[PDB]
Amino acid sequence: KETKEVYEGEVTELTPEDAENPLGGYGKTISHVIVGLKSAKGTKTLRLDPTIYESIQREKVSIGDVIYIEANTGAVKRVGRSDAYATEFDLETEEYVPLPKGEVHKKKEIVQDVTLHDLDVANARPQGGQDV
Amino acid sequence: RKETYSSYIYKVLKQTHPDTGISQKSMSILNSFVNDIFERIATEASKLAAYNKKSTISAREIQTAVRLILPGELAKHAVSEGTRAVTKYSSST
Amino acid sequence: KEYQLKGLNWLANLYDQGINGILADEMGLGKTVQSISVLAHLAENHNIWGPFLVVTPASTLHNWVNEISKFLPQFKILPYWGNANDRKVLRKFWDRKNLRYNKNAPFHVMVTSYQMVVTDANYLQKMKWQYMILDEAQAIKSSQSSRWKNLLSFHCRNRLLLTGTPIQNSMQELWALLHFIMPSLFDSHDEFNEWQQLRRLHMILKPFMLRRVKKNVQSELGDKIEIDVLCDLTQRQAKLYQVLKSQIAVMQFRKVCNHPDLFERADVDSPFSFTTFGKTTSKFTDLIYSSRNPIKY
Amino acid sequence: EKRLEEEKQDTINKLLKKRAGKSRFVKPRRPYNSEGMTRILRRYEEDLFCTF
Amino acid sequence: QAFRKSIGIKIKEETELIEGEVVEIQIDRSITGGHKQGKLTIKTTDMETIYELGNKMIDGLTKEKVLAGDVISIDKASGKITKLGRSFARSRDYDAMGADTRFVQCPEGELQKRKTVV
Amino acid sequence: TIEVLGSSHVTNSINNELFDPLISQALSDIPAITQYNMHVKKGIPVEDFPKTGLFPEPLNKNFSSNISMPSMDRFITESAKLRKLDELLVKLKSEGHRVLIYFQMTKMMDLMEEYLTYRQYNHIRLDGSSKLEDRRDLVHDWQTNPEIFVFLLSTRAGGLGINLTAADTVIFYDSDWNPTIDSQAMDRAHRLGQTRQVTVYRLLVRGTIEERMRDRAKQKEQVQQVV
DNA sequence: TCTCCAGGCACGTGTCAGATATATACATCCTGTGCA
DNA sequence: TGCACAGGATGTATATATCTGACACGTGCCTGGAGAC
């Protein structure tokens, strides 16, 4: 029985801010990213770490997309474009999804089936973090 | 136009218990309670200032009135809270 | 302008006899225009524009007041719905005195429902009536219903019943209907049950009922055809149904027959996170990447 | 005075009773954001290139 | 692997075909050229629609470069862009590319058509 | 994770190895407004930028992550009644019609609303939780607007004397409660003023608990007809 | 003591908690009847 | 005369459907607390 901390909602604001010396050699280009998430009967704002923002921008999210952030590993899933805007003006065969129910911040319990060999090969070849 | 303390004590309850409701009669008891406590403390302070032939009420006579009225561990916690509040307010520099 | 005029004349003759009438035709022929013609004909007969209680379910309350306003706008309308202050000002409105009949009155036609006949029995115990019609009285069939109990306490001395299908045959529904129609004559259910079983039952209620069937008019109503569609069981529905059979629990059987996700909802398919991280043991919120491994060297 | 107040109360009450009796599209496009990005315009008669 | 190479799966897909004449192309790219987006205005003899473009669509446009008056065909599910030819036959042209495409007519009727492919 | 208790140099070395700025900048990209700020408002040339955008692209959009959200097509294929209802509704919408569906559960129409919003069909809902004012203007928009398609209803609300002359096709999802209340259900629908052929569809699942009470319902029909 | 603006008051509107009702199949309990 | 088996009666179980019922939030306003001398 596995418990997941989940942030989810519709992206409404995606605003980064810059570092003082981007060519300083050490430290990334940006310092924080402000993300505005809206779900059903709720709305939250988050100040993202840059390491989370690498996985956010690797999924190629934008303003008007419904996302799904898993706080256990930092993995981000881009669900699809929101249906609150228009539909028939796209050319990339995307999937249109309503707003997620409930609050933005959630905790849910998930029952998983896992063999010991799966844990062995997960720890032997580590894929699933956000590191190099 | 009438005066009550209700929003302040409501906020005090939401700081420690967010999911708790309120009877209006409970506000009537607790408003009477805070007014009665203010009543005894203020006339104890005025009585003590009239004792010392002073025409001024400051923090020290109400400190002595709090020491007189409240029981000892409540007295020490109350003067701790009051001293930290008045030293925070006095740092307007 | 149709054959319900003969039925209303029959009901007026039964009212002139002195007994409470029976109408149990199924809906689809418009008994509402029949009832407003009954009210108009009695108002043309003995010159009464007075108060008229009618019990009606709340789904068709607005439809009935709409058809009253559209059909015959001579009478006055005083509905009953809303909040208790609106109920108080309607209690201010209907304050009649000296009984009988009034010409300049605002309480000519008023509405109600069963749910506030039940809950406002103290205010409605007084003010004896002259006409109460129980429109769509299919829900009266329980003998222990308090709505039937404070419907029995009215001093109206009229019990004209409107319903579609009274043939639920629970053996106390028919005695309850006969007790509501004639209160003095029908008071014992044991003598009703004690006093061939098919022909006599037709002749029990023969002078009261009138035989009208939908298949007498021009059938442009549609002539409904029953198309029964059968489906098989999917393997998720098969698994939940064999689990429910292994437990044998009826509502669970229905709610897994229609759709599997009424019992449990399918959730996100994610890999099992073999991490230890910063979790909450509960103008923005800060989140930082903090996943580590449980294995420490 | 009393008759006028009774008439006003009856008028407001009848208005409330009448209110109780008689009273009781294309989706917008997605927001397009292009800040600090170059522009290529290929119109019908001329081609443009806006740079920084 | 030799066993599993001999089992075939026939997959059915729903696609949408768009054939029309290009009117206006707007392409917005960042300074390094990584993040690409823009709008496409295509027309037939009856309708006129503005579409939104992603990265793969912009990559398919900037290859076999369309020049605002070519008749193109786009498959939505496959992401294939085919330049059928030029209908406007503009006189003023730059002297670098050939642009010697065949003369076709502007298509008429519905701009978008649903199709089933396997 | 490797830990050395009481040393800060190992933490700095581990944080430098795991989160190397050069490699992590190589596996990502700078935002566009940040690039505009450094190229224009800071005077940094393009060739002095850090190397970005070397992460290889996935095959699809689906292949970019390991998290799979509950699907909608599956929501429709694990229930046979909903699947056959979808198959019938495709040709019903192709015919250009008006249709009522009756229900018995709250969530049985709550999920059916989700199916309609997946199909982007025009629909409005009337149930027990609806306020008394809504049962006026909803019926008004039903009998006036022809562009409405689906009318989700319960039994005792939408089946008691309400004028439903603008519909002929009624579908019974699971309404097998009593023969009398079911017989009253199309009495709101099959009424005077109908202009075309009235068809009633009663979908049911076979060899199940549906057959356990449908025989009793037919027995009650025969008993209430002979009596 | 002069000035001045927003804090807390006063008055409207929606949203999860209780209450009758359907309802049929299953399980259990009570009662009648036949047998040793 | 007592006991065991079978049949009928009734409780109930859990999701409904209507359906209120008493609570928490979004706008005016004015006057009294705060700044300055």
Curated annotation (Swiss-Prot), chain A:
Compartments reported by the entry: Nucleus
Superkingdom assignment: Eukaryota
Subunit structure: Probably forms a homohexamer. Interacts with RVB2 and may form heterododecamers with RVB2. Component of the SWR1 chromatin remodeling complex composed of at least ACT1, ARP4, RVB1, RVB2, ARP6, YAF9, VPS71, VPS72, SWC3, SWC4, SWC5, SWC7 and SWR1, and perhaps BDF1. Component of the chromatin-remodeling INO80 complex, at least composed of ARP4, ARP5, ARP8, RVB1, RVB2, TAF14, NHP10, IES1, IES3, IES4, IES6, ACT1, IES2, IES5 and INO80. Component of the R2TP complex composed of at least RVB1, RVB2, TAH1 and PIH1. Interacts with SPT15/TBP and HSP90.
Function: DNA helicase which participates in several chromatin remodeling complexes, including the SWR1 and the INO80 complexes. The SWR1 complex mediates the ATP-dependent exchange of histone H2A for the H2A variant HZT1 leading to transcriptional regulation of selected genes by chromatin remodeling. The INO80 complex remodels chromatin by shifting nucleosomes. Its ability to induce transcription of some phosphate-responsive genes is modulated by inositol polyphosphates. The INO80 complex is involved in DNA repair by associating to 'Ser-129' phosphorylated H2A histones as a response to DNA damage.
Miscellaneous notes: Present with 11600 molecules/cell in log phase SD medium.
Family membership noted in the UniProt record: Belongs to the RuvB family.
Curated annotation (Swiss-Prot), chain C:
Residue ranges of every copy of the Helicase ATP-binding domain listed in the record: 12-184
Cysteines paired by S-S bonds: none
Subcellular location(s) of the protein: Nucleus
Membrane-traversing stretches: none
Motif placement: DEAQ box: 135-138
Coiled-coil parts of chain: none
Positions with a binding annotation for ATP: D25, E26, M27, G28, L29, G30, K31, T32
Family: Belongs to the SNF2/RAD54 helicase family.
More about this protein: Present with 1110 molecules/cell in log phase SD medium.
Role: ATPase component of the INO80 complex which remodels chromatin by shifting nucleosomes and is involved in DNA repair. Its ability to induce transcription of some phosphate-responsive genes is modulated by inositol polyphosphates. The INO80 complex is involved in DNA repair by associating with 'Ser-129' phosphorylated H2A histones as a response to DNA damage.
Subunit note: Component of the chromatin-remodeling INO80 complex, at least composed of ARP4, ARP5, ARP8, RVB1, RVB2, TAF14, NHP10, IES1, IES3, IES4, IES6, ACT1, IES2, IES5 and INO80.
Domain notes: The DBINO region is involved in binding to DNA.
Protein name: Chromatin-remodeling ATPase INO80
Originating species: Saccharomyces cerevisiae (strain ATCC 204508 / S288c)
GN (gene name): INO80
UniProtKB/Swiss-Prot annotation, chain D:
Segments of skewed composition (Basic residues): 15-24
Localization (cell): Nucleus
Disulfide bonds, paired cysteine numbers: none
Protein origin, superkingdom: Eukaryota
Positions of the UniProt region annotated as Disordered: 1-38
Assembly and oligomerization: Component of the chromatin-remodeling INO80 complex, at least composed of ARP4, ARP5, ARP8, RVB1, RVB2, TAF14, NHP10, IES1, IES3, IES4, IES6, ACT1, IES2, IES5 and INO80.
Protein's job: Component of the INO80 complex which remodels chromatin by shifting nucleosomes and is involved in DNA repair.
Misc. comment: Present with 1470 molecules/cell in log phase SD medium.
Similarity comment: family membership: Belongs to the IES2 family.
Protein name, entry field: Ino eighty subunit 2
Species assigned in the record: Saccharomyces cerevisiae (strain ATCC 204508 / S288c) (Baker's yeast)
Gene giving rise to this polypeptide: IES2
From Swiss-Prot, chain E:
Location(s), subcellular: Nucleus, Nucleoplasm
Cystines in this chain: none
Stretches that traverse the bilayer: none
Family: Belongs to the RuvB family.
Complex and partners: Probably forms a homohexamer. Interacts with RVB1 and may form heterododecamers with RVB1. Component of the SWR1 chromatin remodeling complex composed of at least ACT1, ARP4, RVB1, RVB2, ARP6, YAF9, VPS71, VPS72, SWC3, SWC4, SWC5, SWC7 and SWR1, and perhaps BDF1. Component of the chromatin-remodeling INO80 complex, at least composed of ARP4, ARP5, ARP8, RVB1, RVB2, TAF14, NHP10, IES1, IES3, IES4, IES6, ACT1, IES2, IES5 and INO80. Also belongs to the R2TP complex composed of at least RVB1, RVB2, TAH1 and PIH1. Interacts with SPT15/TBP.
More info: Present with 3030 molecules/cell in log phase SD medium.
Reported function: DNA helicase which participates in several chromatin remodeling complexes, including the SWR1 and the INO80 complexes. The SWR1 complex mediates the ATP-dependent exchange of histone H2A for the H2A variant HZT1 leading to transcriptional regulation of selected genes by chromatin remodeling. The INO80 complex remodels chromatin by shifting nucleosomes. Its ability to induce transcription of some phosphate-responsive genes is modulated by inositol polyphosphates. The INO80 complex is involved in DNA repair by associating to 'Ser-129' phosphorylated H2A histones as a response to DNA damage.
